[PDB]
Design a protein around this ligand. Structure first.
Ligand SMILES: [K+]
Ligand SMILES: [K+]
Ligand SMILES: [K+]
Ligand SMILES: [K+]
Ligand SMILES: [K+]
Ligand SMILES: [K+]
Ligand SMILES: [K+]
Ligand SMILES: [K+]
Ligand SMILES: [K+]
Ligand SMILES: [K+]
Ligand SMILES: [K+]
Ligand SMILES: [K+]
Ligand SMILES: [K+]
Ligand SMILES: [K+]
Ligand SMILES: [K+]
Ligand SMILES: [K+]
Ligand SMILES: [K+]
Ligand SMILES: [K+]
Ligand SMILES: [Mg+2]
Ligand SMILES: [Mg+2]
Ligand SMILES: [Mg+2]
Ligand SMILES: [Mg+2]
Ligand SMILES: [Mg+2]
Ligand SMILES: [Mg+2]
Ligand SMILES: [Mg+2]
Ligand SMILES: [Mg+2]
Ligand SMILES: [Mg+2]
Ligand SMILES: [Mg+2]
Ligand SMILES: [Mg+2]
Ligand SMILES: [Mg+2]
Ligand SMILES: [Mg+2]
Ligand SMILES: [Mg+2]
Ligand SMILES: [Mg+2]
Ligand SMILES: [Mg+2]
Ligand SMILES: [Mg+2]
Ligand SMILES: [Mg+2]
Ligand SMILES: [Mg+2]
Ligand SMILES: [Mg+2]
Ligand SMILES: [Mg+2]
Ligand SMILES: [Mg+2]
Ligand SMILES: [Mg+2]
Ligand SMILES: [Mg+2]
Ligand SMILES: [Mg+2]
Ligand SMILES: [Mg+2]
Ligand SMILES: [Mg+2]
Ligand SMILES: [Mg+2]
Ligand SMILES: [Mg+2]
Ligand SMILES: [Mg+2]
Ligand SMILES: [Mg+2]
Ligand SMILES: [Mg+2]
Ligand SMILES: [Mg+2]
Ligand SMILES: [Mg+2]
Ligand SMILES: [Mg+2]
Ligand SMILES: [Mg+2]
Ligand SMILES: [Mg+2]
Ligand SMILES: [Mg+2]
Ligand SMILES: [Mg+2]
Ligand SMILES: [Mg+2]
Ligand SMILES: [Mg+2]
Ligand SMILES: [Mg+2]
Ligand SMILES: [Mg+2]
Ligand SMILES: [Mg+2]
Ligand SMILES: [Mg+2]
Ligand SMILES: [Mg+2]
Ligand SMILES: [Mg+2]
Ligand SMILES: [Mg+2]
Lengths: 110, 48, 103, 142, 150, 56, 117
RNA sequence: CCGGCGAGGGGAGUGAAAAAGAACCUGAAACCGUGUACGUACAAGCAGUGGGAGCACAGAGCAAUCUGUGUGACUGCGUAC
RNA sequence: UGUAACGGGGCUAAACCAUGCACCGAAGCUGCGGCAGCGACGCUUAUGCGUUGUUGGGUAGGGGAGCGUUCUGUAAGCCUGUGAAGGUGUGCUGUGAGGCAUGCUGGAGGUAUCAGAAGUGCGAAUGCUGACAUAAGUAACGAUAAAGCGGGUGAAAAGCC
């Protein structure tokens, strides 16, 4: 029916990745791949690798034809944050959150 | 006459007051001590 | 044809075959109840107005059910005064089916 | 049995035309506001506009008693500091005559979205002519 | 609680609620506000009330037909099987047996039967008298209990 | 200066209503190599307007 | 005998938040705010069981007034006329008739007028 | 099998169970998303409550239509603890 | 700061005085249904029943009666892999604290009744610990000595060679 790929614990805030996921939600995969190729965002590289993996999964594991595939579902979830310390002035310390995301792409011919 | 059929006499076992447990109990918040002053304090009161 | 009558301290305008929810009546389910004080009977253009009751006017009904209505929460709360109280309520009713109206 | 409520999708509205010539402003405005709200109908429902459409002719001939023709003042503020402006009744009749009746009726209609909607059914004209013959308004002697 | 008496931070200026002890019961890892100590829970029972309770219990057993009096109750050998067979013969399963003299064979035979207890007359207690389904007493035990309760 | 009240998730979304990206309207196709490419830019294989302008 | 509070505390908070469904923002999500919103909703409901009787009587009176003036008499005179004619129909029913049976309502107006004459 | 002889993932296989896969029993809440139904771009305030149209949905009914669920235009009242 | 000394519209009465009759109007009074406190009068299986009168706004505070939680006995009993506790929904139910049933999740415990004991109930204490928000994809990326280009390697090179 549908085929999935994910990139869990990707190094980017979900807010940043969602800007890219929104460009391709619902598109034919060939058009999605073109959009990502010409999107100048680091998140576009991340998402394009997940989409390519989902297309390979669909053809190898599920016997799908790539020309019929669409990005039927795509969403980004918040992963764990890495906590770091940033020295500020006057002996004060701040917490830094290095946020991560789980990227999920679903492709299907229906 | 079994260990689960014995009851105390009526009136022999009044439950104790439990202060500071909510409005409905009638002893919430200040627990009957009123507002402020030496007699509301922990350890408060004057000698005999 | 419809008729107006009093029951449970309220008034009701009814036609044959309608089901009316009234305040509780002390009548067993399945019994027939008579409302002999009819305030008005209207059949087409013929209108009889009670002054206060229509002479000989009678409404026949059948007691269909007794029950308790939807629950209502009573909340009392006096802000800043350490006072709150809550109460539940379900009101009794008797449903009756209008079987006859006679002028 | 629950009390009837009028339904906006089936309310019947009629068209009337009223002549303001020589009528006392406020006493015309109350009847207008009543009928724009629908208070004259047994189907009146406070949250539904059940009122009628009313064309008002000869708005510049409306009357006022006492010395109001020169002494009634209409104020407004532009929102700019110092921007309090005024016009006497006679100045208003000279420049924007429909506004006298429109202002009076708007003040007697409900405030909020529904009252604004009721105001949209009022059509005031300075002179003796209107272009709503297609609506076949009936003469209303207010 | 193990820790030092140092004030965690100064009374004023930091913008935190005031702290005085790292051991405050308000704090995680702090003390228990009213920490328990070992307690002696025993109650006094007046002598006459204890005896009166026993008399009431025995009388209720008689009225409920849970007291069985026998001339003798013994087994030939200290074997659990013999006592099991004897109790089955007398149609007893959950039973307290009071003897005038504690028979060693009987005691040993009853040890491994968990519904069955064996005592001398001087060792009866109210909870056991109520808790066992039946109470078997020898005539000598009955006389001893009568004398003990006067 | 700092807020007196925590803004809502609704208001956060309203501010971000202008943040979405826009995809490239359409790519151009080289008349000789047939590669897609950004308009007025060379292709990945080094063509522009049908001429091999640069090696590799 | 130490007692952990979690199971009972969760049930209480969940009861309140269930009563808060449909409320805006923290009012349907956050226990502290939902509790205040549930209490206030209860207070308003107590008040408005009393208000409901007032608002419906006011509506019935307005409709009776309109129907009576269609028939050439004011509300106040219509009510006084019914009272002089010993007619005990209440305002709920009079408003229902005013909307649904205009001929019967006209008959009631005629009874009131005859009593007043 | 995709990927950088990655991270991560999809299959296959083990197992009673793999949303028991080692970031591993159960897996709450705050908080953050995707999908659907309804509302929302002429409208002024503790955001509810009383009244209430329309729309969607699930049942029932020969039909007329009725009821339960979600939403809530418009309207009376209403300044949290 | 802006009409700004009828709440507004507006009013020559829709103002004021006098007389009269209607009507609106509150959680007041009445009607209908229900619950409880106290007192009388009678029954009685002696602690409840019936009739009746009357009362039931409350802070401090006094008095009365209960819900639920963990643990001990009753319990080597009873429920439970034909699915325990916990989690999440739905229906029903009582005046309330609450109770009951059941779908899904869970995968091994739970425990009636009547008694017994308390680390027995949280929204506040600039409470304590952990988790996660907001501001915000904002400020900033640490000396204004400065970079440009060709080649290499590499998945990728402004920063490496
Ligand atoms: K006290
Ligand atoms: K034994
Ligand atoms: K939430
Ligand atoms: K599991
Ligand atoms: K765990
Ligand atoms: K999880
Ligand atoms: K406008
Ligand atoms: K609806
Ligand atoms: K409202
Ligand atoms: K009474
Ligand atoms: K057990
Ligand atoms: K309930
Ligand atoms: K449940
Ligand atoms: K369960
Ligand atoms: K127990
Ligand atoms: K706190
Ligand atoms: K942010
Ligand atoms: K950025
Ligand atoms: Mg330093
Ligand atoms: Mg008190
Ligand atoms: Mg205080
Ligand atoms: Mg003082
Ligand atoms: Mg004091
Ligand atoms: Mg002290
Ligand atoms: Mg208003
Ligand atoms: Mg400790
Ligand atoms: Mg002694
Ligand atoms: Mg402030
Ligand atoms: Mg932006
Ligand atoms: Mg424990
Ligand atoms: Mg929620
Ligand atoms: Mg791997
Ligand atoms: Mg599982
Ligand atoms: Mg296990
Ligand atoms: Mg887990
Ligand atoms: Mg959750
Ligand atoms: Mg629209
Ligand atoms: Mg609009
Ligand atoms: Mg606003
Ligand atoms: Mg409602
Ligand atoms: Mg208001
Ligand atoms: Mg108000
Ligand atoms: Mg001025
Ligand atoms: Mg006034
Ligand atoms: Mg007078
Ligand atoms: Mg009233
Ligand atoms: Mg009263
Ligand atoms: Mg009564
Ligand atoms: Mg009172
Ligand atoms: Mg009281
Ligand atoms: Mg136990
Ligand atoms: Mg437990
Ligand atoms: Mg346990
Ligand atoms: Mg107990
Ligand atoms: Mg405690
Ligand atoms: Mg808490
Ligand atoms: Mg508090
Ligand atoms: Mg602070
Ligand atoms: Mg922060
Ligand atoms: Mg800013
Ligand atoms: Mg800036
Ligand atoms: Mg900057
Ligand atoms: Mg700097
Ligand atoms: Mg630097
Ligand atoms: Mg270079
Ligand atoms: Mg550099």
């Amino acid at each position: 029916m549908e085929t999935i790929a994910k990139h869990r614990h990707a190094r980017s805030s979900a807010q940043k990745v969602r800007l890219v996921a929104d460009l391709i939600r619902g598109k034919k995969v060939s058009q999605a791949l073109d959009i990502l190729t010409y999107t100048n965002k680091k998140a576009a590289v991340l998402v394009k690798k997940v989409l390519e993996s989902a297309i390979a999964n669909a053809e190898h594991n599920d016997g799908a034809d790539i020309d019929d595939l669409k990005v039927t579902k795509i969403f980004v979830d918040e992963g764990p944050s890495m906590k770091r310390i940033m020295p500020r002035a006057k002996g004060r310390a701040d917490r830094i959150l290095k946020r991560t995301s789980h990227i999920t792409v679903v492709v299907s011919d229906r | 006459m079994r260990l689960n059929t014995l009851s105390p006499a009526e009136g022999s076992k009044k439950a104790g007051k439990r202060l500071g447990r909510g409005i409905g109990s009638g002893l919430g918040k200040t627990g009957g001590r009123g507002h402020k002053g030496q007699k509301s304090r922990s350890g408060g009161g004057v000698r005999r | 044809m419809y008729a107006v009558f009093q029951s449970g301290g309220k008034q009701h305008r009814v036609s044959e075959g309608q089901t009316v929810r009234l305040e509780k009546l002390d009548i067993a389910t399945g019994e027939t109840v008579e409302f002999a004080e009819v305030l008005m009977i209207a059949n087409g253009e013929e209108v009889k107005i009670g002054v206060p009751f229509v002479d000989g006017g009678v409404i026949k009904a059948e007691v269909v059910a007794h029950g308790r209505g939807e629950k209502v929460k009573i909340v009392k709360f006096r802000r800043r005064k350490h006072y709150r109280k809550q109460q539940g309520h379900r009101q009794w009713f008797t449903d009756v089916k209008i079987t006859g109206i006679s002028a | 049995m629950k009390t009837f409520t009028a339904k906006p999708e089936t309310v019947k509205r009629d068209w009337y035309v009223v002549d303001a010539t020589g009528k006392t402003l406020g006493r015309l405005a109350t009847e207008l506001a009543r009928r724009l709200r629908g208070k004259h109908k047994a189907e009146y429902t406070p949250h539904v506009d059940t009122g009628d459409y009313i064309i008002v002719l000869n708005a510049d001939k409306v009357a006022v008693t006492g010395n109001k023709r020169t002494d009634k003042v209409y104020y407004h503020h532009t929102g700019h500091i110092g921007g309090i402006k005024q016009a006497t009744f006679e100045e208003m009749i000279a420049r924007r005559p429909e506004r006298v009746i429109e202002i009076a009726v708007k003040g007697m209609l409900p405030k909020g979205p529904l009252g604004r909607a009721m105001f949209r059914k009022l059509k005031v004209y300075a002179g003796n002519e209107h272009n709503h013959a297609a609506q076949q308004p009936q003469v209303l002697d207010i | 609680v193990t820790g030092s008496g140092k004030k965690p931070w100064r009374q004023k200026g930091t913008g935190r609620a005031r702290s005085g002890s790292i051991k405050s019961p308000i704090w995680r890892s702090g003390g228990v506000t009213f920490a328990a100590r070992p307690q002696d829970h025993s109650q006094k029972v007046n002598k006459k009330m204890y005896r009166g309770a026993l008399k009431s219990i025995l009388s209720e057993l008689v009225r409920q037909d849970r007291l069985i009096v026998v001339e003798k109750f013994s087994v030939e050998a200290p074997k659990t099987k013999l006592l099991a067979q004897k109790l089955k013969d007398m149609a007893l399963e959950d039973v307290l047996i009071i003897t005038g003299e504690l028979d060693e064979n009987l005691f040993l035979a009853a040890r491994n039967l968990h519904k069955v207890d064996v005592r001398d007359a001087t060792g009866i207690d109210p909870v056991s008298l109520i808790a066992f389904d039946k109470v078997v007493m020898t005539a000598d035990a009955v006389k001893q209990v009568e004398e003990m309760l006067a | 200066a700092v807020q007196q009240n925590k803004p809502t998730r609704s208001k956060r979304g309203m501010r971000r209503s202008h943040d979405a990206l826009t995809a490239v309207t359409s790519l151009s196709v080289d008349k000789t190599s047939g590669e897609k490419h950004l308009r007025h830019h060379i292709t990945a294989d080094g063509y522009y307007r049908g001429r091999k302008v640069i090696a590799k | 005998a130490r007692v952990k509070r979690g199971v009972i505390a969760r049930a209480r908070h969940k009861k309140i938040l269930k009563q808060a469904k449909g409320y805006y923002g923290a009012r349907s999500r956050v226990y502290r705010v939902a509790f205040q919103a549930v209490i206030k909703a209860g207070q308003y409901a107590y008040r408005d069981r009393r208000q409901r009787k007032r608002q419906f009587r006011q509506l019935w009176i307005a409709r009776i007034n309109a129907a009576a003036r269609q028939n050439g008499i004011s509300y106040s005179k219509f009510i006084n006329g019914l009272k002089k004619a010993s007619v005990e129909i209440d305002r709920k029913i009079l408003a229902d008739i005013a909307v649904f049976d205009k001929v019967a309502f006209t008959a009631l107006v005629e009874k009131a007028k005859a009593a007043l004459a």
